[PDB]
């Protein structure tokens, strides 16, 4: 694990960049679901379908 970490550092290679980008998208999903769950609360499932 420690040897991997120094090779990653040498190659200028962020191993978390993936999980970062992902956590940031999971927030925009949460946000858009909140907008859409609201319109369902206002208009009703019958009207939206």
């Amino acid at each position: 694990r420690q040897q991997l970490q120094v090779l990653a550092r040498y190659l200028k290679m962020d191993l978390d960049n993936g999980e970062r980008k992902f956590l940031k998208e999971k927030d925009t999903v949460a946000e858009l679901q909140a907008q859409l769950d609201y319109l369902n609360a206002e208009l009703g499932e019958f009207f939206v379908n």
Binding site: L43, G44, E45, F46, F47
Partner: protein, 96 residues
Amino acid sequence: EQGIELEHIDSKSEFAHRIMLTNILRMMGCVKKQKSARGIETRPAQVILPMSPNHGTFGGDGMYSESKLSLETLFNRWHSESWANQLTVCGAIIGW
């Protein structure tokens, strides 16, 4: 909409009102814009609206009576707006 009294007007009735009134107005609105685009001033479309004689007199109809009664505004607006050459209203009070 059956056994929807005023306590129970929700999503179905609000959607029904759109089918039976606002999107009727939007469809005559649309045929006016298409007829005007092409300068058709002498070939009007006769709209035949199904009216009711019975506005509110049974209940449990949801927003049906509000839908039906609000089309009687088109007999006045035909004189008062700029779409009489594109559209004519013929309201049919359909019975039993």
